[PDB]
Design an enzyme around this catalytic site. Structure first.
Site, PDB file in Angstrom:
ATOM      1  N   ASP A   8      -8.963   0.119   1.393  1.00  0.00           N
ATOM      2  CA  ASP A   8      -8.462   1.477   1.230  1.00  0.00           C
ATOM      3  C   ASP A   8      -8.176   1.804  -0.229  1.00  0.00           C
ATOM      4  O   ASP A   8      -8.403   2.938  -0.665  1.00  0.00           O
ATOM      5  CB  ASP A   8      -7.196   1.664   2.066  1.00  0.00           C
ATOM      6  CG  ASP A   8      -7.394   1.271   3.517  1.00  0.00           C
ATOM      7  OD1 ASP A   8      -7.609   0.070   3.784  1.00  0.00           O
ATOM      8  OD2 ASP A   8      -7.331   2.162   4.390  1.00  0.00           O
TER       9      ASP A   8
ATOM     10  N   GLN B  46     -33.547 -11.630 -10.692  1.00  0.00           N
ATOM     11  CA  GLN B  46     -32.270 -11.095 -11.146  1.00  0.00           C
ATOM     12  C   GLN B  46     -32.393  -9.730 -11.816  1.00  0.00           C
ATOM     13  O   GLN B  46     -31.369  -9.189 -12.246  1.00  0.00           O
ATOM     14  CB  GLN B  46     -31.616 -12.068 -12.133  1.00  0.00           C
ATOM     15  CG  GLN B  46     -31.336 -13.468 -11.590  1.00  0.00           C
ATOM     16  CD  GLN B  46     -31.475 -14.545 -12.646  1.00  0.00           C
ATOM     17  OE1 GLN B  46     -30.491 -15.161 -13.057  1.00  0.00           O
ATOM     18  NE2 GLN B  46     -32.705 -14.790 -13.083  1.00  0.00           N
TER      19      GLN B  46
HETATM   20  N1  LIG Z   1       7.691  -1.335   6.076  1.00  0.00           N
HETATM   21  C1  LIG Z   1       7.281  -2.623   6.605  1.00  0.00           C
HETATM   22  N2  LIG Z   1       8.142  -3.580   6.818  1.00  0.00           N
HETATM   23  C2  LIG Z   1       7.865  -4.758   7.285  1.00  0.00           C
HETATM   24  N3  LIG Z   1       6.663  -5.164   7.615  1.00  0.00           N
HETATM   25  C3  LIG Z   1       5.729  -4.226   7.420  1.00  0.00           C
HETATM   26  C4  LIG Z   1       5.947  -2.892   6.905  1.00  0.00           C
HETATM   27  N4  LIG Z   1       4.663  -2.348   6.905  1.00  0.00           N
HETATM   28  C5  LIG Z   1       3.669  -3.131   7.344  1.00  0.00           C
HETATM   29  N5  LIG Z   1       4.356  -4.289   7.651  1.00  0.00           N
HETATM   30  C6  LIG Z   1       3.723  -5.446   8.163  1.00  0.00           C
HETATM   31  O1  LIG Z   1       2.413  -5.675   7.464  1.00  0.00           O
HETATM   32  C7  LIG Z   1       1.401  -5.716   8.563  1.00  0.00           C
HETATM   33  C8  LIG Z   1       0.136  -5.049   8.148  1.00  0.00           C
HETATM   34  O2  LIG Z   1       0.420  -3.857   7.474  1.00  0.00           O
HETATM   35  P1  LIG Z   1      -0.621  -2.595   7.681  1.00  0.00           P
HETATM   36  O3  LIG Z   1      -0.623  -2.142   9.068  1.00  0.00           O
HETATM   37  O4  LIG Z   1      -0.163  -1.393   6.990  1.00  0.00           O
HETATM   38  O5  LIG Z   1      -2.135  -3.023   7.194  1.00  0.00           O
HETATM   39  P2  LIG Z   1      -2.609  -3.024   5.617  1.00  0.00           P
HETATM   40  O6  LIG Z   1      -1.940  -4.086   4.870  1.00  0.00           O
HETATM   41  O7  LIG Z   1      -2.128  -1.835   4.920  1.00  0.00           O
HETATM   42  O8  LIG Z   1      -4.248  -3.145   5.520  1.00  0.00           O
HETATM   43  P3  LIG Z   1      -5.248  -1.854   5.735  1.00  0.00           P
HETATM   44  O9  LIG Z   1      -4.840  -0.663   4.997  1.00  0.00           O
HETATM   45  O10 LIG Z   1      -6.628  -2.086   5.321  1.00  0.00           O
HETATM   46  O11 LIG Z   1      -5.351  -1.403   7.121  1.00  0.00           O
HETATM   47  C9  LIG Z   1       2.013  -5.003   9.712  1.00  0.00           C
HETATM   48  O12 LIG Z   1       1.510  -5.528  10.964  1.00  0.00           O
HETATM   49  C10 LIG Z   1       3.438  -5.271   9.609  1.00  0.00           C
HETATM   50  O13 LIG Z   1       3.749  -6.495  10.322  1.00  0.00           O
HETATM   51 MG   LIG Z   2      -2.972  -0.036   4.403  1.00  0.00          MG
END
Ligand SMILES: Nc1ncnc2c1ncn2[C@@H]1O[C@H](COP(=O)(O)OP(=O)(O)OP(=O)(O)O)[C@@H](O)[C@H]1O
Ligand SMILES: [Mg+2]
Ligand SMILES: Nc1ncnc2c1ncn2[C@@H]1O[C@H](COP(=O)(O)OP(=O)(O)OP(=O)(O)O)[C@@H](O)[C@H]1O
Ligand SMILES: Nc1ncnc2c1ncn2[C@@H]1O[C@H](COP(=O)(O)OP(=O)(O)OP(=O)(O)O)[C@@H](O)[C@H]1O
Ligand SMILES: Nc1ncnc2c1ncn2[C@@H]1O[C@H](COP(=O)(O)OP(=O)(O)OP(=O)(O)O)[C@@H](O)[C@H]1O
Ligand SMILES: Nc1ncnc2c1ncn2[C@@H]1O[C@H](COP(=O)(O)OP(=O)(O)OP(=O)(O)O)[C@@H](O)[C@H]1O
Ligand SMILES: Nc1ncnc2c1ncn2[C@@H]1O[C@H](COP(=O)(O)OP(=O)(O)OP(=O)(O)O)[C@@H](O)[C@H]1O
Ligand SMILES: Nc1ncnc2c1ncn2[C@@H]1O[C@H](COP(=O)(O)OP(=O)(O)OP(=O)(O)O)[C@@H](O)[C@H]1O
Ligand SMILES: O=P(O)(O)OC[C@H]1O[C@](O)(COP(=O)(O)O)[C@@H](O)[C@@H]1O
Ligand SMILES: O=P(O)(O)OC[C@H]1O[C@](O)(COP(=O)(O)O)[C@@H](O)[C@@H]1O
Ligand SMILES: O=P(O)(O)OC[C@H]1O[C@](O)(COP(=O)(O)O)[C@@H](O)[C@@H]1O
Ligand SMILES: [Mg+2]
Lengths: 761, 761, 223
Positions: free
Chosen positions: B156, B652
Site C-alpha cells: 500500500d 541483461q
Molecule cells: N491500533 C492497533 N493496535 C494494536 N494492534 C493493531 C492495531 N492495528 C493493527 N494491529 C494489528 O496489526 C495486524 C495487521 O494490521 P493491518 O490489518 O492493518 O494490516 P497491514 O499491516 O496494514 O498490511 P496491509 O496494509 O497490506 O493490509 C492486525 O491484525 C492487528 O493485530
Molecule cells: Mg495497511
C-alpha cells in the site's frame, strides 16, 4: 641423518668431459641441501696444491644455469705436483685449512688413480705434515680419514670397472652429427668418408660410433686388424661399391695400430683407398669437437644422479669403508671400490702392452666385446650355411619412434644370419590382417639406422578386431614367430594374441615385444626405444626457449611436453633443463601445491636467476591446463616476472634417433632375435612349433641391471590399461632429485642409493 | 561493538509483501553474525500471543534459500488479541521467557501501530505481569526496555513517514506485467482496458501504475474526480479515439470515490464507457496477484539492506532512544521514530475522513503530489498559450538503456508544455553532426514508455571528432539547449562540448546529461536509467540457473555478468540471488582469496545447501577469467560438487524497462526539462542564450537524498576515464552485506547506517 | 523406496525439475541390488519417468529378464527430457518448457540491438546430438539458420548462409539470429561460427554470441 658440520670438496681434473657441470651442480646443490659446506676446488689438483684463493665455499647460485654448459666451470688442469709427494702434501694442507675431510673427484682414469694414491697416503701425509709443524696434533686426529667418492668424467671410457662415463654420450652426439652430415645428404658420387676419433687409448668411442653409423671397417686398438688387412679392407669396399652403396665410412681411432706396435695413420688409410679404389677420400678429424657442444640429455640426467649419489655415499661413509666410484651398470646405480677399478685399469694397460693382448679385449668389459661382435655381424653378410624352417614377421605398432628402423635392421640381419625366413609387415597389425607381408633380405634394410620415424608403416589398431585376418595371414605365410617393435599398443596387441591362444591354435607362436615409443610408457622396461631422442629434442627446445629471455628480462616459460599420462618425459626433461617444476599425472597436485610453487618461483625470480622454467605433462591435470598455469603464473608474478607459453607439439617426435637410441635398438634387436631363436629351438617338437606357455611372449627389458624378458601376462598385473602406462615406474624417485635441485624441501627418505659392489672380475 | 548476550525477535504481520523473506533472511543472518540469538516468531503477533512452539531459535540455515521466495516463510496472521491488553500481556510474557529484549516487526501501518502501542505499554505491561505473579521482580528489572525496529512491508505504501516500502516495487512488477500483456500486442480493434488495483486505503500503486503505463484516466482516493467527471472522462476517451489511438487504459483504485463518500466501482466505469463509447470494455482485477510472484531485484536489495540496518539499529539502541522504522528516503538510509510516523498516519486518515480532504494529498508526501501532477501533465496535451523563442535538441548517446524512451517522452511533453521547440536527433552526436535533427510533437512520443532500448538511435561516437559539424548544426537549427540521455559516453561528450566552449561560441548552450546505462558507471548519480532493468533481468537468469540443479545435485554456477569495469551490476545481482561471491574490479583478488572462497564454498556445499552461485564481472581480472574460475572450482570441488558456466551476454540488455525505470526516467525527464527551462531563463541575455559557466552543464543526479545537478567539470575529478567509471562509488559498502550474508567474517566497520531524522512535517 | 500417499504429491504440478531425485546411472551395473530391492518391496510394476537413460535402462532390464526372474514385471517409460531425444514419442515431457525458455532468451537477445545497430547473434542451444530443440526454437524466433547434427553441414553451406545473411542484412531487416546445437559439428563450434560471421560480415554487421546453458532447463513447466 644429515651431514651437518662437515665439509665436502668437489674438484674436476683431466679432459673436460661435457656433463661435468651437471655433476658439479648436483654435488654442490646436494651438499648445501643436506647442510654440508661445499668447497669448489678450481683447476682440479692444481688448485688443490696451491689452494688458498682456488678453494671457495659454494652457495646455491654458484652452480646456477650451468647444467647446459659443456666443459667445466670449475676448470681442470694437468699438474705434475700431485704426482710427487711435495705437492700432494701441500694439497693435503690446503684441504685441512678448510676442514675438507670429504672429496668428490670428477675426472678420468688418471684423475681417479691420483685420487686413489692420495687416499692411500692421506694418513702418512698428515703425519708428515704435523711432524714438519704446519698443523698441530690436535686438529689432525680429526680429519684423520679422507673420504673419496669418484665420478668418471671422460670421453675415453677407459676406466675398466665402469660401463658408462659422463660425456661419452655427448661425444657420440658430436661424432654422429658429423656422420649424419654425410649420410643424410643425397649421395651423388662415389666417396669415402674416413672419420678419425680421438680414442687414443680406448677405442670405445670408435666402436660405438661405428655401430651407430654402420661403418664398413673399424680400426680400434682393442682388436687390431689381422695381417693382410690391406687387401681384405679394399675388397670389402669393392663389393660395397658393386652393391651400388655410394658411401664408405671408415672409423679409425687415433690409437689405431696393427698387430705390431706400428700405428696406422688416417693419412695412410686415405692414400690406400685413393690408390686401389680411386674414391674421393677425405679424412675428417674431430679433435676438440668431441669434447664440445652441449651435454646430451642422458649426460645431464646421469651426471645429476651420480653427483647426488656421490654426496650421499660421502655422508654414509665411515672411516673403514674404502674409496668408491659412483656409477651405473645398466640402469642400476652402483658403487665400486676405487682400488679394484684402478687395479683393473692397470691390468688392462699391461695386457694391451703385448702381455695378454688377444685377451685384453675381454678384460675391457663384456659390453665392449659384445658391441664389437654385433658390429661385425651386421657390417658384412657372411654366408649362412646353416638353415632352419623357422620364419618370423617383424611389426611396427603404435606411434613411430626414433630407433624402430635400427631395431628392424638388426633383427633382419640377425634372423638371416641364423637361417630364419624373415618377413616384415607394413602398417603393423593392419598389414598383418590385410596381408601386406613382404619377405625381406639383407640389403633391403641398408641404411635404416639413421632414418627417423618408421620405414615400415605404423598403425595403432589393436589385433582383437581383425583377429581372424591375422591368424589367416599367419597360416598363409607360415609365420612361426612375431617380433613386435612398438609402444603400448604393441605390448597390448601381443597380450591380446596371447590371450586368444586358447581360441586359435595358430597364435601359439613365440612372440617378443621391443618397447619403442616416445612416452616410455611400456611396462617391462625402463627405457623404451626412442625415449632418449624425445628427451633430447625436448631439452633442446627448452634450452632455446630459456635462451630467449635475455639480459634484464625476468620471464618464466610454461612448456608442455608430450607422453600421455606417463610423466617420464616431463620429469627427465625437467632434470636435464633445470626446470623448476615438472607437473605430471603420477604426482597429483592441487591449487595449494601450485601456490607454493608460484611463490617459490616468485622468490627465486627476485634473486639473480631471471629465467624460470616449469614443465607440464600434456595430461597431468584435467582442469589446471597449460592455459590455467599461464594465467596463474602471470597473475601472481605481476610486477616481478612475465609469463609465456610454448606447447612443444611434434617437435619431440620426428627427429632422427640419437646415437644412444641407434645403439640401443641395434643391441636389443640382436638380443631379441637371439632369444627368439633359442626359444623357438626349445619349443620345436613333433615337427612343428607350439608355443603355449606364458614365457613364449615376453617384452625385452633392460629393467634394472641387464636385459630381461618379462612375460606379457605377468606384466598385465602392473599395467594401468586405462592410462596406458605401468603402475610402478622406476623413475618416480627422480622427482625427488628434480625437486631437491630446485630448492624444494622434500624429505627424500624414499630414495634408494646404490650400495657397494665388487668389480665383476 | 557486537551484540553478544542479547536476543533478537523477528516477526512478520499484515499482508505478506513479497520481499519479506529477504528482510527476514538479512535480519536473521546479521543477528547471528554479530553473535546475538535470533528467534523466529511464526504467524506474527499470533505466534507472539500463543508463543511456545511458535517461537523457535534460528540458525544460519533456517533462512537459507528464501530470498527469491515471495510471501513470508515465517507466516503472517491477523490477530485481534494484540489489539487488547489481555493478549498483549501474554505477548510480553512469551518474549520475556526467551529473553527477547529486541523485536523487529515487518509489516504495514497497522502492524507498526501495534508495535508502537506495544512499546508504549511495555513498562506498564511488565509491571502488571509481575504484579499478577507470572514473572519475578528480578528478571523484570532486566528486560525493562523493549527495542522496536520497524520495517514497512506492504504493497500500500500507506505509512506516511516513509517514501518507499518493501513489496511496492514487486506489486508494480505484477501490475505492469499485466498491462504489458495488453499494450505490447499489435492493437487491432478499439478496446478499453479498465485495471482495478487493491489500493483501498492508499492510491500510490494506482498512481505509479498510471504513470508507468500512461493511463488515460486515474481514480485515486487522494484526489477524487470533480463533479461531472462522467462527461469529462468520456470526452477524453472520445478525442483519444479520434487521434487513432486504439486502446484506452483506466486505472481505478479499489478505494476510488467521488467528491462525496460514494465509491466508484470498476463495473460502473466499465458500463459507463460501454454505454457512451461502445468500446470493448473489460475490467481486469488483479486481486491476490499483486502480492504474488517473486520479489523484484529492488525489493531483494532494499529488503536485505533495511533488514541489516534494522538489526544494527537494534543493537546500538539504548533505553532512551525511541522505537524507529528503518527506511530509505531516496537512496539514503534513514531511521524515523515510530511514534511520529504513526501520528502522521493518523493525521492523514483523519484528513481523508472529510476534515482537510483537499489538503490531505500534501500530507501524504511530496512524492505522491509530484507524481500525480506529472501524470496529469503528460496524460493530456493542454494548450501551451505561453511561448518562448528557445529550442532544444534531445540526444541519445552510448549503448541503449531500458528507460531512455520514457525519459525522452517526458522531456518532449514537458518542453512542449513550456512552449519550447523540441527537436530529437537520431543517432546522438552522429546525427547532430549529420543534421539528423527532427522537430517533434506531442504525439510523436506516444507509447514510448514501455518500449525498451532507444527509439532514437544511439551511437557511442564522441563529439570531438565532428565538432565543427556539431557547432554548424547547432547554429543552423538554433539549438539553445542540449538534452543528452545516455551512459558514460553521454557525460564524456557533454564534457567535451563544455571544454570546447573555449573555442566555439555556438557550444555556449545549456547542456544536461540524463545517466542512462546498464553498467551504472556514470558519475554524478546513484542509479543510471536502466540499471534496475538490467539487475532484474540478471537475477532472473541467475534464479533460473540456480533452479536448474533441482535440489539434489550439488552444483556451483559461474555466472558472468556485464557492466564493464563497473562492478555494481555484479554485486547487487549477487545480493539479490544470494551469490556466494561476486568478483569485481573494484575489489582486487588474488589466488589466496580464491582459495579462501573455494574452500568456503566446499564447506558450505557439504551442508544442506546444494546450489552455489558465484558471479564474475566481465572485466574484473585480466587472467582469472570465467574459464579460470570454472577450472578452479571444479577441480577443488572434485568429489563434492560439479561446476558449470553461463555467460549472461545481452540477456541483461534488451528487456522492456521495469516499472521503476519507467517512473524514474519519467520523473527525471520532467525534472531535467524543468531545470533546462529555469537555466535558460536564468541565462538568456541581450537577445540570445549564452551559457558558459560550468553549472550550466550538469548531470541530473539522485546522488544521496533527492535529485541533484552535478556540474560535469566538477565530476571530472572523481571520474576514472580509463575504466569509464567514477573513482568513488556509493555501492562498495554493499559488498560487506553480500559477504556477511555468505558467512564471510568481514570487519564491516566501514559500513555507515542512517541516523535518526524527524519527519519532514 | 518410500511408499507414497495421495497428499504426498500435493502441489507437485507447477514445480520444475524433480522432487524425487534423478540420476543417469543405468541399471546394468547394480542389477543385483535392483532385483533384491524389487523382491523385498514386492514391486509388480515399474513406472520410469525420464529421458533416453530411462528408456535405455528399461531396455536393459527387459533384456536381463532371461537372467533374473524378478525382472519379469510390467514396465512403462514416460519420456521426460529437454532434448526430445527419446524414441517412441513425438514430444518428450518438458521439451515444450525448454523450447519456451529458449525462445524467450532468443527474443530478448534479438531485441538487444533495438533497431539501431544491425547485428547477428549466434545462440547455442542444448539437446545433445538431437537437434529438435534448436530447429523448433529457430522456427519460433525466425532464426536464419539452426545448425544441427542430423543435417550435416560443411564450410560451403556456411558460406552460402553467411552470404545470404549479408544480403538480408543490407535490406530492411537488421537483427539476424542463427542457432547452433551444442553437438552439431565437431570442429565448427560456436567460436568458429562467431569468427566466420564476424569476419565475413565486416563492414555490414557485428556478430555476438550467447551460449544458453541451463537457462533452458530449470524453469517451471509450461501449461
Ligand atoms: N491500533 C492497533 N493496535 C494494536 N494492534 C493493531 C492495531 N492495528 C493493527 N494491529 C494489528 O496489526 C495486524 C495487521 O494490521 P493491518 O490489518 O492493518 O494490516 P497491514 O499491516 O496494514 O498490511 P496491509 O496494509 O497490506 O493490509 C492486525 O491484525 C492487528 O493485530
Ligand atoms: Mg495497511
Ligand atoms: N698415477 C698418478 N698419480 C698421481 N696423480 C696422477 C696420476 N695420474 C694422473 N694424475 C693426476 O691427475 C691429473 C689428470 O690426469 P690425466 O692427465 O692423466 O688425465 P685423466 O685423469 O686420466 O682424464 P683424461 O685423459 O680424459 O683427460 C694429472 O694432472 C695428474 O696430476
Ligand atoms: N667390419 C669389420 N671391422 C673391423 N674388423 C673386421 C670387420 N670384419 C671382419 N673384421 C676383422 O677381419 C678379420 C677376418 O674377418 P672375417 O670375419 O671375414 O674372418 P673370420 O675368420 O671369421 O674372423 P672373425 O670371425 O673372428 O672375426 C677378423 O679378425 C675380424 O676381426
Ligand atoms: N637419415 C637418412 N634418411 C634417408 N636415407 C638415409 C639416411 N641415412 C642413410 N640413408 C640412405 O641409406 C642408403 C644406404 O647406404 P648407407 O651408406 O647409408 O648404408 P649401407 O652401407 O648401404 O648399409 P649398412 O646399414 O650396413 O651400413 C644411403 O644411400 C643413404 O641415402
Ligand atoms: N489524466 C487525469 N486523470 C484523472 N483526473 C484527471 C486527469 N486530467 C484532469 N483530471 C481531473 O479533471 C479536473 C479538471 O481537469 P483540468 O486539467 O482540465 O482543469 P484544471 O483547472 O487545470 O485542474 P487541475 O490543475 O487542478 O489539475 C481536475 O481536477 C483533475 O483532477
Ligand atoms: N512495447 C511496445 N512496443 C512497440 N510499440 C508499442 C509498445 N506499446 C505501445 N506501442 C505502440 O504505441 C502506440 C501508441 O499508442 P499508446 O497506447 O501506446 O500510447 P497513447 O495512449 O496513445 O499516448 P501516451 O503515451 O502519452 O500515453 C500504440 O498504437 C502501440 O502500437
Ligand atoms: N512452484 C512451487 N514451488 C514450490 N513450492 C510450491 C509451488 N507450488 C505450491 N508449492 C507448495 O506446495 C504446497 C502444497 O499445497 P498446494 O496448495 O499448493 O497444493 P494442493 O492444492 O493442496 O494439492 P493438489 O495438487 O492436489 O491440488 C503449498 O503449501 C506450497 O507451499
Ligand atoms: O601412444 P604413444 O605411444 O603414447 O605415442 C605418443 C604420442 O601420441 C600422442 O598422443 C600424439 O599422437 P598424435 O599426434 O597422432 O595425435 C602424444 O602423446 C605423443 O606425441
Ligand atoms: O559501455 P556501457 O555504457 O557500459 O554499455 C553497456 C553494454 O556495453 C558492454 O560493454 C557490451 O556492449 P557490446 O556488446 O555492444 O559490445 C556491456 O558492458 C554492456 O552490454
Ligand atoms: O541427457 P539428456 O536427456 O539429453 O538431458 C538434456 C540435458 O543434459 C545436457 O547434456 C547437459 O547436462 P549437464 O549439465 O549435466 O552437463 C544437455 O543436453 C541438457 O541440458
Ligand atoms: Mg684420462
Amino acid at each position: 641423518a644429515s651431514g651437518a658440520g662437515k665439509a665436502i670438496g668437489v674438484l674436476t681434473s683431466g679432459g673436460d668431459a661435457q656433463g661435468m657441470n651437471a655433476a658439479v651442480r648436483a654435488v654442490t646443490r646436494m651438499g648445501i641441501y643436506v647442510g654440508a659446506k661445499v668447497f669448489l676446488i678450481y683447476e682440479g689438483y692444481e688448485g688443490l696444491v696451491e689452494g688458498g684463493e682456488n678453494i671457495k665455499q659454494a652457495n646455491w647460485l654458484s652452480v646456477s644455469n650451468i647444467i647446459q654448459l659443456g666443459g667445466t666451470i670449475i676448470g681442470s688442469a694437468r699438474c705434475k705436483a700431485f704426482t710427487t709427494r711435495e705437492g700432494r702434501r701441500a694439497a693435503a694442507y690446503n684441504l685441512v685449512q678448510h676442514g675438507i675431510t670429504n672429496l668428490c673427484v670428477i675426472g678420468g682414469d688418471g684423475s681417479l688413480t691420483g685420487a686413489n694414491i692420495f687416499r692411500s697416503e692421506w694418513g702418512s701425509l698428515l703425519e708428515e705434515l704435523v711432524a714438519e709443524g704446519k698443523i698441530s696434533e690436535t686438529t689432525a686426529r680429526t680429519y684423520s680419514h679422507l673420504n673419496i667418492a669418484g665420478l668418471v668424467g671422460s670421453i675415453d671410457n677407459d676406466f675398466c670397472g665402469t660401463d658408462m662415463t659422463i660425456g661419452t654420450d655427448s661425444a657420440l652426439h658430436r661424432i654422429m652429427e658429423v656422420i649424419d652430415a654425410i649420410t643424410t645428404t643425397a649421395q651423388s658420387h662415389q666417396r669415402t668418408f674416413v672419420l678419425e676419433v680421438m680414442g687414443r687409448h680406448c677405442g670405445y668411442l670408435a666402436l660405438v660410433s661405428a655401430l651407430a653409423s654402420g661403418a664398413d671397417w673399424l680400426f680400434i686398438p682393442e682388436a687390431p686388424p689381422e695381417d693382410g688387412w690391406e687387401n681384405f679392407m679394399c675388397e670389402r669396399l669393392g663389393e660395397t661399391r658393386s652393391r651400388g652403396s655410394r658411401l664408405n665410412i671408415i672409423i679409425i681411432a687415433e690409437g689405431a695400430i696393427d698387430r705390431n706396435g706400428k700405428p696406422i695413420s688416417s693419412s695412410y688409410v686415405k692414400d690406400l683407398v685413393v690408390q686401389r679404389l680411386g674414391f674421393d677420400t677425405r679424412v675428417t678429424v674431430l679433435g676438440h669437437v668431441q669434447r664440445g657442444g652441449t651435454p646430451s640429455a642422458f649426460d645431464r640426467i646421469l651426471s645429476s644422479k651420480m653427483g647426488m649419489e656421490a654426496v650421499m655415499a660421502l655422508l654414509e661413509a665411515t672411516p673403514d669403508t674404502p674409496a668408491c666410484v659412483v656409477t651405473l651398470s645398466g640402469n642400476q646405480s652402483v658403487r665400486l671400490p676405487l682400488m679394484e677399478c684402478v687395479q683393473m685399469t692397470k691390468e688392462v694397460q699391461k695386457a694391451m702392452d703385448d702381455k695378454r693382448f688377444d685377451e685384453a679385449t675381454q678384460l675391457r668389459g663384456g659390453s665392449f666385446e659384445n658391441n664389437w661382435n654385433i658390429y661385425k655381424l651386421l657390417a658384412h653378410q657372411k654366408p649362412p650355411k646353416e638353415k632352419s624352417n623357422f620364419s618370423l614377421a617383424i611389426l611396427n605398432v603404435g606411434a613411430p619412434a626414433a630407433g624402430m628402423n635400427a631395431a628392424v635392421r638388426s633383427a633382419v640381419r640377425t634372423g638371416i644370419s641364423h637361417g630364419h625366413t624373415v618377413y616384415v609387415v607394413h602398417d603393423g597389425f593392419e598389414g598383418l590382417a590385410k596381408g601386406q607381408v613382404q619377405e625381406v633380405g639383407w640389403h633391403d634394410v641398408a641404411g635404416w639406422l639413421g632414418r627417423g620415424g618408421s620405414m615400415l608403416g605404423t598403425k595403432r589398431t589393436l589385433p582383437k578386431g581383425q583377429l581372424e585376418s591375422i591368424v589367416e595371414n599367419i597360416r598363409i605365410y607360415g609365420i612361426h614367430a612375431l617380433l613386435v617393435v612398438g609402444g603400448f599398443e604393441a605390448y597390448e596387441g601381443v597380450l591380446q594374441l596371447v590371450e586368444a591362444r586358447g581360441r586359435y591354435e595358430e597364435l601359439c607362436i613365440v612372440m617378443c615385444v621391443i618397447p619403442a615409443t616416445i612416452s616410455n610408457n611400456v611396462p617391462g622396461t625402463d627405457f623404451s626405444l626412442g625415449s632418449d631422442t624425445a628427451v633430447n629434442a625436448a631439452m633442446e627446445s627448452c634450452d632455446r626457449i630459456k635462451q630467449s629471455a635475455s639480459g634484464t628480462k625476468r620471464r618464466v616459460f610454461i612448456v608442455e611436453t608430450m607422453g600421455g599420462y606417463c610423466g617420464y618425459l616431463a620429469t627427465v626433461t625437467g632434470i636435464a633443463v633445470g626446470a623448476d617444476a615438472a607437473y605430471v599425472f603420477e604426482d597429483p597436485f592441487n591449487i595449494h601445491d601450485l601456490k607454493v610453487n608460484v611463490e617459490h618461483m616468485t622468490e627465486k625470480m627476485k634473486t639473480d636467476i631471471q629465467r624460470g622454467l616449469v614443465l607440464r605433462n600434456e595430461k597431468c591435470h584435467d582442469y589446471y591446463t597449460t592455459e590455467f598455469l599461464y594465467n596463474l603464473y602471470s597473475s601472481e608474478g605481476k610486477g616481478v616476472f612475465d609469463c609465456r607459453t610454448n606447447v612443444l607439439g611434434h617437435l619431440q617426435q620426428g627427429g632422427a634417433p640419437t646415437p644412444f637410441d641407434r645403439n640401443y635398438g641395434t643391441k636389443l634387436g640382436v638380443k631379441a632375435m637371439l632369444w627368439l631363436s633359442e626359444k623357438l629351438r626349445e619349443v620345436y617338437r613333433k615337427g612343428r612349433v607350439f608355443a603355449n606357455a606364458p614365457d613364449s611372449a615376453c617384452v625385452i627389458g633392460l629393467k634394472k641391471k641387464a636385459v630381461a624378458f618379462s612375460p606379457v601376462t605377468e606384466l598385465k598385473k602392473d599395467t594401468d590399461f586405462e592410462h596406458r602406462m605401468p603402475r610402478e615406474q622406476w623413475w618416480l624417485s627422480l622427482r625427488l632429485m628434480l625437486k631437491m635441485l630446485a630448492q624444494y624441501r622434500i624429505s627424500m627418505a624414499a630414495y634408494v642409493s646404490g650400495e657397494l659392489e665388487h668389480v665383476t672380475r
